[PDB]
């Protein structure tokens, strides 16, 4: 299901072409702009390592953070950067992008590969 048909089928969005960070747009968003970093950023999302949730639902309000400002794992710094407003969107990540082979017990072991789905609400510039 959704993590294989992102190995399939989705894009690589890293500059190293390392395949850390592969991506696919499930719901088209509008708007030329994307955040930049050091916006404030509004999502929905649904997380999971990719070998089978912790869901911003859970929490019944959507997850704030800054752009690029190590908040949040590398590769959502990279992914939400790429998103449009109202945009959802498929990520699947390697350790090298998220926890590493350190990890983050006890709710990330050790080179662990994550799954997101991701709906970008809004952002605003700092
Ligand atoms: C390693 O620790 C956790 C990882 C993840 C979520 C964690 C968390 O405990 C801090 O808490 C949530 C249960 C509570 C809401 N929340 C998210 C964050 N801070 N508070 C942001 C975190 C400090 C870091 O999280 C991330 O960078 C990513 C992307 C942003 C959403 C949360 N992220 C996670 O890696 C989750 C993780 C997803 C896979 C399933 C296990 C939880």
Known sequence: GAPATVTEQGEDITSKKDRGVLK???????????????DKVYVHYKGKLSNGFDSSHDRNEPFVFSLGKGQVIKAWDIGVATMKKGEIAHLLIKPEYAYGSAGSLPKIPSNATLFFEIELLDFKGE
């Open 24 to 38: 696919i747009v499930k719901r088209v968003g509008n708007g030329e702009e994307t955040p930049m970093i050091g």
